[PDB]
Amino acid sequence: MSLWVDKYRPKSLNALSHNEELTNFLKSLSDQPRDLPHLLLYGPNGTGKKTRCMALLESIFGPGVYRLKIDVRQFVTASNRKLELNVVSSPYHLEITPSDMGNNDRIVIQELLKEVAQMHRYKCVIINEANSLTKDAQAALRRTMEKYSKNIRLIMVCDSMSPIIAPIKSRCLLIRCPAPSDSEISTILSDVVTNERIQLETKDILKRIAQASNGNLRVSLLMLESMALNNELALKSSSPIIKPDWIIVIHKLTRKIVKERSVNSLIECRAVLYDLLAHCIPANIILKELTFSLLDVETLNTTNKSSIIEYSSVFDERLSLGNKAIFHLEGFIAKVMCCLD
Amino acid sequence: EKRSKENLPWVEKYRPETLDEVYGQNEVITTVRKFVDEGKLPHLLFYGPPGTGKTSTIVALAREIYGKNYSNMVLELNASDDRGIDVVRNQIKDFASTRQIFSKGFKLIILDEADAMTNAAQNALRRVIERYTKNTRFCVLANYAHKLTPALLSRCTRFRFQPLPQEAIERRIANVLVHEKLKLSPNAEKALIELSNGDMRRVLNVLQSCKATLDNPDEDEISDDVIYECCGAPRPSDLKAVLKSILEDDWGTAHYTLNKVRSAKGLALIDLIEGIVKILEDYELQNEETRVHLLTKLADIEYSISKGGNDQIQGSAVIGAIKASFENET
Amino acid sequence: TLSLQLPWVEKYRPQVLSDIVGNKETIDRLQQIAKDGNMPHMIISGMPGIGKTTSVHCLAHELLGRSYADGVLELNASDDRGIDVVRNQIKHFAQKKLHLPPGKHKIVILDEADSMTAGAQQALRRTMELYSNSTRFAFACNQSNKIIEPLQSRCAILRYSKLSDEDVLKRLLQIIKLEDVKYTNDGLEAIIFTAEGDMRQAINNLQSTVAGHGLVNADNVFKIVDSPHPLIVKKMLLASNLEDSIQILRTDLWKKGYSSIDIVTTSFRVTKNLAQVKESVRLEMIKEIGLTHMRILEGVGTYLQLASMLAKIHKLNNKA
Amino acid sequence: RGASEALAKRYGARVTKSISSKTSVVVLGDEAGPKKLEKIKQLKIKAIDEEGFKQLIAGMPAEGGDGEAAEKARRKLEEQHNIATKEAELLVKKEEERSKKLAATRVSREEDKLWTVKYAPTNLQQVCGNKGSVMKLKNWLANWENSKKNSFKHAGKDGSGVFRAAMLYGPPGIGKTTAAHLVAQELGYDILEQNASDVRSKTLLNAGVKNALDNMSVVGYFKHQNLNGKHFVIIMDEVDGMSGGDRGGVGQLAQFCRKTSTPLILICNERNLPKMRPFDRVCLDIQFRRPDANSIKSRLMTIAIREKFKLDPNVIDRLIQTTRGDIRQVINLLSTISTTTKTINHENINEISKAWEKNIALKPFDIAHKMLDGQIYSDIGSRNFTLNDKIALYFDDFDFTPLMIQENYLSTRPSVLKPGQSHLEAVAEAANCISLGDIVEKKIRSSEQLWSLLPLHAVLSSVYPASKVAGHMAGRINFTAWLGQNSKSAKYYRLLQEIHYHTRLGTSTDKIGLRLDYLPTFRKRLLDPFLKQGADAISSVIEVMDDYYLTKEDWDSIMEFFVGPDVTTAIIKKIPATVKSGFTRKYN
DNA sequence: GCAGACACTA
DNA sequence: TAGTGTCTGCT
DNA sequence: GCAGACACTACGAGTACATA
DNA sequence: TTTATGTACTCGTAGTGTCTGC
Ligand SMILES: Nc1ncnc2c1ncn2[C@@H]1O[C@H](COP(=O)(O)OP(=O)(O)OP(O)(O)=S)[C@@H](O)[C@H]1O
Ligand SMILES: Nc1ncnc2c1ncn2[C@@H]1O[C@H](COP(=O)(O)OP(=O)(O)OP(O)(O)=S)[C@@H](O)[C@H]1O
Ligand SMILES: Nc1ncnc2c1ncn2[C@@H]1O[C@H](COP(=O)(O)OP(=O)(O)OP(O)(O)=S)[C@@H](O)[C@H]1O
Ligand SMILES: Nc1ncnc2c1ncn2[C@@H]1O[C@H](COP(=O)(O)OP(=O)(O)O)[C@@H](O)[C@H]1O
Ligand SMILES: [Mg+2]
Ligand SMILES: [Mg+2]
Ligand SMILES: [Mg+2]
């Protein structure tokens, strides 16, 4: 559409120039669609997993997968805590997300799937953000997909499938979606810049865009569009690579941690973290970016880096096992400051 | 039920019907028999592990007091039925207040598995017990005493059911083998004692499964091989071999031995860990730190096994923990 | 079916304020209130078994024996207590016209009042404020912190302490002479030690000893009832060697049929109430014991978890 | 310190809690607050150690000598005894007056009554403390008709004219109900009172006092010069008894505060509950407080003289300190003790105090202040304040205590630091234990509901973190910021979901990737044309906005998601209003 | 702990 | 009208 | 006999508590 | 205020039945 990331998205398996072996595997699966088992696509973020899923649906069902609408279904949990969730439905398939309350994502998996399992001969259900389920929706989904299988099938899209429980991974055909190299990102961006009109001198700037995104199609495409808009559709050799405001704030926090290691610095870090969590930014991604920004500082030796990564792993476990996200991040920053000073 | 007995599990087919058929807790049975013979039965509280004969004892006691029709003379409440404070305020109050409808004796209230009762229900039960103690006795059966209010524990005489000893399990096994015309080797008997862990129900279930295991239930005797194959438990020889390979040989031999032992008969890793722990408690360790390292590391490993994961990694962790702990010896 | 004799707990319940033993000052105050008759609103609190509700009943009986049936309303947790079933009944009783001696008032005994709803207490506030000329209230709860602040403001707080060994011993000897039963001093001290200040527990254990063996000696007493598990857990935590604590745990708890969750909760309570060791040591022990408690609650209840918890206790105690 | 203060008050010496310039002598110990250490040195105040305290008792003669300070204190003490004796026979003469009148009526029950009822304040001059609040209430009530004539538009100097209804709030036992009733009775009004004994839900409030807003007393006509004898003063004692968010009558009482044609008075105990939030700016808030010990001292001297039992005058201060300013409970204590113990003196005061101590639950701020003190974690301090005491202190406000500990555990200067341990190490340990307590808290509040695990959470989240960083607060006790930030984050998540599902079609990216990647790009397609060319790109911005099914409301919502150098609040402000005005109109 | 208001005394 | 003594809310 | 007029039980929604 | 089941309480309402009356 208006954004270039959604303008040139492929709509078919033959329209993909991203992974040849993966596209061949999907063609093999779509060659015999009747015995298609429940799939589970996992890989790094932004590589095009849902593009693969929609292309596979188009290859199995046909054009009309992308002619999709949104309808709202009313779900009632215990007591009268009314919850509104909208399903992005379509002919030949259904799409659901755990975007409901994390502790109330079980009721949608129960009722909606029991309703659509009522009656070519099957309907496909796509579950985005599948790694965000809370071990109860998955527990229901185990028997939900084991019992009803001749009329409903699942394409479970997720990244970093470790939170997915063992039985679900057992009854799901795991499919791995690797990120492209620099050449493939540069080729896709070049196709974008030749389909549209952008003045460019040396393609090294496209290589820099590919480097900055770190194997991310969405980030690279949005960065290319943003840099073209800022440069008035004339990319320069020394064009400044943009970064998200969150990345700038995280880098400033890392510089503050490295420079000053007092307790007033700790309360300033608490304020910055409070703003970041208040502005719709997940805690685990925050901890990962803070860790890999601290490890990119050249003034630290190997002992400090090893202690930082060890505490990062410990507090990542704590974040995965806890709910108050600010507590574990504050503990991690305090431990890192105590280690460095 | 249907088709009378012989279609029941041996757990329910061999439930004691008389206080003389309750083995093990000799002191408890003698004390309650003296209580009912002397005509003074206080508010009893039966505490102990599962399978030790608490509900069997109270059922046999009620049958001895009343007779065959004790079920209509006794209000038995359990966690299966709803036991809110409305129940205490209406059903228990009416049963304690009213006279006997079938005899001229006292009322007996059995609060089976009462550790799953709310605090307010017990608070009401305190006053109910104290008010109507002249013609109504309360019996409380519980596995955990920390879920009972201290006042309720104060109001009730506490009887502790100790885990079944050697003689009681042997006597019940002999009775079952006599009834079923079944044979069993003495080493198989010791293996069943080891697998009992103070639980008679486990003994009965293993006996039933081992009778079903034999190709012909007649003229074939249960051996320790049958017990270990049906229960899946590791043999003591296998545990000793695994421990010797870990403690004496290098990593390749220890890893190969553990993998071979696990894959020969499908042994579980948690069973091997429990057997190894039971063997190592008899060791005369020189250092105080070897015990600490062994206990902490093996507890962490068994916790991770309970949460699930990779069995190969956990087995290698077991070998490494044992070897590293025993490296502190000298 | 044969009838049962009255238990010694209720057979020998005191009927006057002189037979009750324990807090001499509180009982003397109750007897002076008895003589005067102007009994104020009172809250009676303490640990169970030290003579809370029997003192209230004795005071009411001696105050108005002829009218105990008429002008005493004994509501309790067994009875349905709420907002309306309390406000209507207590208001009707307080406004009820009944002719007492000049120094007597109607008594509303709220036995086991710590479980009452807050709104019921709010209504009770104005009930007591309005009808204090005719009726008087007498609460009796184990935990006095449940009663709201204004009620404790409009009441006379009477705190009951656990009885010393001397008072329980005196009552035990009195009941022994009344029952004419043989005993040994060792058995009586064992009964006192097992009771831990609870008179009802002492009476129950003494009656069990008499009815099970006949002679109150140390052997019979320890046969019928075991030593309390808080003490064995306390000496398990305070032992020097790890082997000593391990064998104490195994023999005296695991082979005695004690649940692992009970052992962990008892260890937590002892460590919270433990006093000789330093505060930080207790905090560290509580932290690791709570970790073990979480492991037990999640389902992993074994001997190995308890042994590991004891090993961590010793690794903390020996200072690395 | 407690025992020495008891001996200091044993001889009638005032023990102030703060050091002053007019302070005579200060007893010096070993270590205390640094403010006291710097104050004593500069003002050159007399200092006597404990060794001089022992000889002070023997060397000082009775009555305090003829010193100027001692003489002034004695005559004030004598005046307190003089006014005590003056009013002692006031009721005795009244008692003889009613007895003679009662005897005549019988021809032609007392001394069996609660002491808090017979010794109730007969008039407004018999109250003890809160004189200013009582006079404020009286001035509001006596001038309610004047504000009624002026249609509650303009108030007076005090400002009570605009407020149709007055409100009373304060701790128990200090005399709110008695003051309100006496002010109503003195002016001649007819007291219409409700309470928690009868239902006060919406239905019977609409069917009860609702018709009493503009109706008078039927007894008012038959009780009659009196000008206010035919009106209503609504006295709702125990407003806290309306324990209903919706079915409760708190909003209904707010509607009465909106519209009422007669004076209305409310009496409650705590005002700051979220249940009673709609009473924030509704009524003339008259606050009562714990009265000072002198008035209660005089009243207790009168009572003791009238009851033929004697207590030492200095004991009254300790009795008030024990009961936390609850006068009614003090009278109850006196009545209970006087039955058998007729001598309340220096020997019985300690036993009386430790027997009648009031265990009042603490507020969250007081809980945090008490918990982050370095004295209670010392060797001597922890013996008096055991671990179970700290657990109970947490359990007073267990829902708020861990948050209050986490808010300000690194804002205090530690005094329990281990040798060689820096402040940052202690903060790190406290934060680690706070994280562990958070894990335990998540386990507690889950599907399993392991509520037996509460004391472990108590320790891990409040006691262990505080025992590492306890001491003196550098700043002030701050309320937890997690509640407001959590509400803000939940609202921002709701908006993120709304815009994500508005642009759901055509976008193969979840809500997490919308904020991280898509939203920064939308700013430079929906705000930069406003910045670099102004209104000349009104159609292009609308074209992009309409393409992703984005409305005008979503445009403002997207701008608030940015942080750091990309904050667009100032960018939109700098945009001229003429440029922004056209954008809204064209979309509509 | 940090003010902030209400008193008694000066 | 200005120094202490002391109770009280900060969300 | 039929339509109210009543008091009754029952169901539903909402709030609060959960270790001493 | 968030918290996630289960319990207990309180209230309000809707049916459900029975008693007066004409
Ligand atoms: N002392 C015993 N003598 C004979 N059989 C016993 C004895 N204890 C247990 N059993 C057997 O165990 C079976 C089940 O145990 P029960 O006594 O019914 O239950 P329980 O022992 O009370 O355990 P819980 O606490 O209810 S799980 C009975 O049917 C008996 O066959
Ligand atoms: N001080 C005492 N003197 C004599 N008997 C006592 C005393 N305290 C308790 N008892 C006996 O204990 C039994 C019941 O005591 P209660 O007073 O009913 O217990 P309680 O004080 O009410 O504790 P709770 O909280 O209600 S369980 C009776 O047999 C009493 O005789
Ligand atoms: N200021 C006072 N001076 C003298 N006596 C008082 C005073 N305040 C209270 N009292 C005594 O306490 C009794 C009751 O006081 P109340 O005014 O009912 O207390 P309260 O302010 O209403 O607190 P609540 O309503 O119970 S929370 C009176 O009858 C007096 O005996
Ligand atoms: N073969 C391809 N050619 C062009 N663009 C592609 C290709 N594969 C993926 N993309 C880009 O990837 C984006 C979608 O990635 P996405 O589905 O968000 O990955 P993930 O599901 O892993 O987050 C689309 O905008 C599309 O432009
Ligand atoms: Mg049973
Ligand atoms: Mg009692
Ligand atoms: Mg009042």
Look at residue D472 and give its three-state secondary structure: strand
Q: Chain A: list its partners (3+ Cβ pairs within 8 Å).
A: D
Residues C22 and C131 in one domain: yes
User: Which of C8, C78, C308, C318 to probe the B interface (max B CBs under 10 A)?
Assistant: C78
Q: How much distance in Å is there from the Cα of C10 to the middle of ligand 2?
A: 9
Ligand with an atom nearest the CA of residue D172: 3
Phi and psi torsions of D461, nearest 5°: -100, -15
Residues C136 and C56 in one domain: yes
D518: tokens are 């898509």
Ligand with an atom nearest the CA of residue C55: 2
Q: How far apart are CA C97 and CA C131, in angstroms?
A: 11
- Of the partner residues D173, D436, D453, the one whose CB lies closest to the CB of residue C297: D453
Q: How much distance in Å is there from the Cα of C13 to the middle of ligand 2?
A: 8
Pocket mutation for ligand 3, best pick of D174, D197, D266 (most atoms within 8 Å of C-beta): D174
Cβ contact C73:C84 at 8 Å: no
B315's CB contacts (< 8 A; 6+ apart) are B255, B258, B259, B262, B269
| CA neighbor of C100 nearest in space, from C129, C63, C73 | C63
Look at residue D312 and give its three-state secondary structure: coil
| Span(s) in chain A for CATH 1.10.8.60 | 182-235
**Among C111, C131, C163, where does a domain finish?**
C163
Cβ contact D563:D519 at 8 Å: no
Q: How far apart are CA C249 and CA C47, in angstroms?
A: 29
Measured between CB atoms, does C204 come within 8 Å of chain B?
A: yes
Q: How far apart are CA D78 and CA D12, in angstroms?
A: 13
Ion ligand 7 — residues with CB under 5 Å? D 177, 237
Cβ contact D164:D266 at 8 Å: no
CA distances from D370 to C283, D2, D5, D376 (A): 18, 17, 21, 9
Q: Give Rg (Cα) of chain C.
A: 24
Cβ contact B47:B159 at 8 Å: yes
CA distances from A310 to A313, A314, C288, D434 (A): 5, 6, 21, 19
Q: Angle at which helices A105-116 and A137-147 pack, to 10 degrees?
A: 10
Residues C246 and C318 in one domain: yes
Between chains, do B298 and C308 touch, taking CB under 8 Å as contact?
Answer: yes
Measured between CB atoms, does C315 come within 8 Å of chain D?
A: no
Look at residue D66 and give its three-state secondary structure: coil
* D204/G3 CA-to-C1' distance in Å: 30
Residue C228 exposure: Cα atoms within 13 Å on the Cβ side: 18
Per CATH, the architecture of A182-235 is what?
Answer: Orthogonal Bundle (1.10)
Residue length, chain A?
341
Tell me, in Å, the resolution of the deposited structure.
3.1
Looking at residue B142, the DSSP 8-state letter turns out to be E
| CA neighbor of B318 nearest in space, from B249, B247, B238 | B247
Q: How far apart are CA B264 and CA D50, in angstroms?
A: 83
Phi and psi torsions of D63, nearest 5°: 70, -5
Element (H, E) at D524: helix D519-526
Residues C106 and C157 in one domain: yes
Indicate the burial class of C168 (C-beta count within 10 angstroms; 0-12, 13-18, 19 or more). buried
Work out how many domains chain C is built from and give that number.
Answer: 3
**H runs (alpha helix) in B140-287:** 150-155, 166-180, 186-196, 200-213, 224-231, 236-248, 251-265, 269-280
Atom of ligand 2 nearest to the CA of C8: 29
Looking at residue A237, the DSSP 8-state letter turns out to be T
Q: How much distance in Å is there from the Cα of B257 to the middle of ligand 4?
A: 50
Cβ contact B177:B183 at 8 Å: yes
C243's CB contacts (< 8 A; 6+ apart) are B291
Atom of ligand 1 nearest to the CA of B56: 17
For residue B298, the chain C residues in CB contact (below 8 A) are 304, 308
Distance from CA of C35 to the nearest CA of D (A): 10
Nearest nucleotide to C145, CA against C1' atoms: G20
Between chains, do D453 and C294 touch, taking CB under 8 Å as contact?
Answer: yes
Give ∠ CA D61-D14-D297 in degrees, rounded to 5: 105
Residues C156 and C175 in one domain: no
The residue assigned the tokens 């009555």 is: D63
Q: Does residue B53 have its Cβ closer than 6 Å to ligand 1?
A: yes
| Strand G at less than 7 A from CB of D410 | no
Residues C72 and C124 in one domain: yes
Q: Does residue A11 have its Cβ closer than 6 Å to ligand 4?
A: no
Q: Is B196 annotated as a binding residue?
A: no
Q: What chain C residue is nearest to D330 in terms of C-alpha separation?
A: C153
Give me the DSSP letters along chain C.
Answer: ----PPPHHHHT--SSTTT--S-HHHHHHHHHHHHH--PPPEEEE-STTSSSHHHHHHHHHHH-STTTTTSEEEE-SSS--SSHHHHHHHHHHHH------TT--EEEEEETGGG--HHHHHHHHHHHHHSTTTEEEEEEES-TTSS-HHHHHTSEEEE--PPPHHHHHHHHHHHHHHHT--B-HHHHHHHHHHHTT-HHHHHHHHHHHHHHTSSB-HHHHHHHSPPPHHHHHHHHHT-SSHHHHHHHHIIIIITTT--HHHHHHHHHHHHHH--SS-HHHHHHHHHHHHHHHHHHHTT--SHHHHHHHHHHHHHHHTT-
| Strand H at less than 7 A from CB of D247 | yes
Residues C154 and C88 in one domain: yes
A129's CB contacts (< 8 A; 6+ apart) are A97, A98, A99, A157, A158, D510, D512
Q: How far apart are CA A190 and CA A172, in angstroms?
A: 36
Indicate the burial class of D318 (C-beta count within 10 angstroms; 0-12, 13-18, 19 or more). buried
Looking at residue A160, the DSSP 8-state letter turns out to be S
Phi and psi torsions of B111, nearest 5°: -100, 80
Strand partners, A74: A84
Chain gaps in chain C, named by the residue before each (C–N > 2.5 Å): none
Residues C158 and C232 in one domain: no
Look at residue B160 and give its three-state secondary structure: strand
Residues C219 and C234 in one domain: no
CA distances from D556 to A245, C32, D587 (A): 18, 77, 14
Nearest CA, atom 22, ligand 3? D177
Per DSSP (E only), the strands in chain B are 44-47, 74-77, 107-111, 136-142, 157-160, 183-184, 221-222
| CA neighbor of C259 nearest in space, from B83, D241, B146, D376 | B146
Between chains, do C242 and B292 touch, taking CB under 8 Å as contact?
Answer: yes
CA distances from D219 to C116, D155, D215, D216, D361 (A): 38, 32, 12, 9, 44
Query: How far out from the chain centre does Cα B206 lie?
Result: 14
Residues C53 and C144 in one domain: yes
Residues C158 and C239 in one domain: no
Cβ contact B121:B64 at 8 Å: no
A62: tokens are 């046909």
Cβ contact C65:C161 at 8 Å: no
The answer for D 217-246 residues in CB contact with C (under 8 A) is 237-238, 240-241, 243
Chains C, D in contact, 3 or more Cβ pairs below 8 Å:
yes
- Of the partner residues A136, A249, A331, the one whose CB lies closest to the CB of residue D435: A331
Phi and psi torsions of B138, nearest 5°: -110, 135
Per CATH, the architecture of A4-176 is what?
Answer: 3-Layer(aba) Sandwich (3.40)
- Of the partner residues D438, D488, D508, the one whose CB lies closest to the CB of residue A278: D488
The answer for C 23-82 residues in CB contact with B (under 8 A) is 47-49, 76-80
Residues C11 and C114 in one domain: yes
Phi and psi torsions of D166, nearest 5°: -100, 155
Range of the domain at C184: 164-227
Q: Does residue A45 have its Cβ closer than 6 Å to ligand 4?
A: yes
For residue D319, the chain C residues in CB contact (below 8 A) are none
Looking at residue D348, the DSSP 8-state letter turns out to be T
D67: tokens are 């010193």
> Letter for the amino acid at B145?
A
For residue D455, the chain C residues in CB contact (below 8 A) are 268, 272, 290
Q: What chain D residue is nearest to A336 in terms of C-alpha separation?
A: D428
Report the structure determination method.
Answer: cryo-EM
The answer for D 468-497 residues in CB contact with C (under 8 A) is none
Q: For D120, left (φ over 0), alpha (ψ -120 to 50), or beta?
A: beta
B256's CB contacts (< 8 A; 6+ apart) are none
Pocket mutation for ligand 2, best pick of C146, C199, C207 (most atoms within 8 Å of C-beta): C199
Cβ contact A168:A141 at 8 Å: yes
* C81/G7 CA-to-C1' distance in Å: 23
Ligand with an atom nearest the CA of residue A176: 4
B124: tokens are 């009401």
Q: How far apart are CA A327 and CA D433, in angstroms?
A: 10
Q: How far apart are CA A242 and CA A222, in angstroms?
A: 10
Look at residue A327 and give its three-state secondary structure: helix
Q: How much distance in Å is there from the Cα of B163 to the middle of ligand 5?
A: 14
Distance from CA of C260 to the nearest CA of B (A): 9
The answer for D 396-455 residues in CB contact with A (under 8 A) is 406, 410-411, 422-425, 427-428, 431-432, 434-436, 438-439, 441-442, 447
Q: What chain B residue is nearest to C197 in terms of C-alpha separation?
A: B154
Q: Does residue C265 have its Cβ closer than 6 Å to ligand 2?
A: no
- Give the pairing of strands C106-111 and C72-75: parallel
For residue A51, the chain D residues in CB contact (below 8 A) are 508
Between chains, do B39 and C4 touch, taking CB under 8 Å as contact?
Answer: yes
Cβ contact A213:A79 at 8 Å: no
Q: How far apart are CA D474 and CA D16, in angstroms?
A: 24
- A114: how many CB neighbours lie within 10 A of its CB? 12
Indicate the burial class of D277 (C-beta count within 10 angstroms; 0-12, 13-18, 19 or more). exposed
Looking at residue B124, the DSSP 8-state letter turns out to be H
Q: How far apart are CA B315 and CA C7, in angstroms?
A: 59
CA distances from D171 to C151, D168, D269, D300 (A): 13, 10, 6, 20
Q: How far apart are CA A309 and CA A297, in angstroms?
A: 13
Per DSSP (E only), the strands in A97-172 are 123-127, 152-157
**H runs (alpha helix) in A117-244:** 137-147, 166-170, 182-195, 204-213, 217-230
Cβ contact C203:C188 at 8 Å: no
D204: tokens are 């019977």
| Span(s) in chain A for CATH 1.20.272.10 | 245-340
Residue A260 exposure: Cα atoms within 13 Å on the Cβ side: 11
Q: Give Rg (Cα) of chain B.
A: 25
Chains B, C in contact, 3 or more Cβ pairs below 8 Å:
yes
- B328: how many CB neighbours lie within 10 A of its CB? 16
Q: How far apart are CA C295 and CA C305, in angstroms?
A: 8
> Letter for the amino acid at C221?
V
Between chains, do C153 and D326 touch, taking CB under 8 Å as contact?
Answer: yes
One of 1.10.3720.10, 1.20.272.10, 3.30.420.40, 2.40.50.140 is the CATH number of A245-340, namely 1.20.272.10
Indicate the burial class of B204 (C-beta count within 10 angstroms; 0-12, 13-18, 19 or more). buried
C83's CB contacts (< 8 A; 6+ apart) are C117, C119, C120, C123
